[PDB]
Amino acid sequence: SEAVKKWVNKIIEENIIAVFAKTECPYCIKAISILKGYNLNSHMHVENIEKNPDMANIQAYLKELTGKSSVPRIFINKDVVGGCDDLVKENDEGKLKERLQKLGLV
Ligand SMILES: [Cl-]
Ligand SMILES: [Cl-]
Numbered sequence: 001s002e003a004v005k006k007w008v009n010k011i012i013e014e015n016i017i018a019v020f021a022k023t024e025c026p027y028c029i030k031a032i033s034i035l036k037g038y039n040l041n042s043h044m045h046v047e048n049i050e051k052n053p054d055m056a057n058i059q060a061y062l063k064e065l066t067g068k069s070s071v072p073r074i075f076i077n078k079d080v081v082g083g084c085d086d087l088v089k090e091n092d093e094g095k096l097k098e099r100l101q102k103l104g105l106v
C-alpha cells in the first residue's frame, strides 16, 4: 500500500518530532512526556495508530523504517530515535539535548 506509506511519510516529514503511539500505552505516555518536558509540543505530532483501520500496515512500515513494529516509534527530523528506552538512553547520555540544540529547539 503506497497510500499507507505516503501517509506515514507525511507525518514524519511535516513534523520535526513524530511519535507513533497507541491507546493506553505507558511507554508511549512516558516518551511523549519526556519530549514535552523539552517544550517541544509546537514541533511535535503524536499519531495514535491503534485507532486506525490500517494499524498492521502502519506497524509493518514502521518496522521497515526502524527495525521494530512496536509503539512508541520516535523520529526526530526524520532520523530514527527508536522506542522509549532508546529515548531514555539518549536523554540520560546527553544525546537528546544535543539533537534538539542542533535543530534550534532548545
Ligand atoms: Cl528501534
Ligand atoms: Cl526498541
Ligand SMILES: [Cs+]
Binding pocket: 037, 038
Ligand atoms: Cs528536560
Ligand SMILES: [Cs+]
Binding pocket: 041, 042, 043, 044, 045
Ligand atoms: Cs502538537
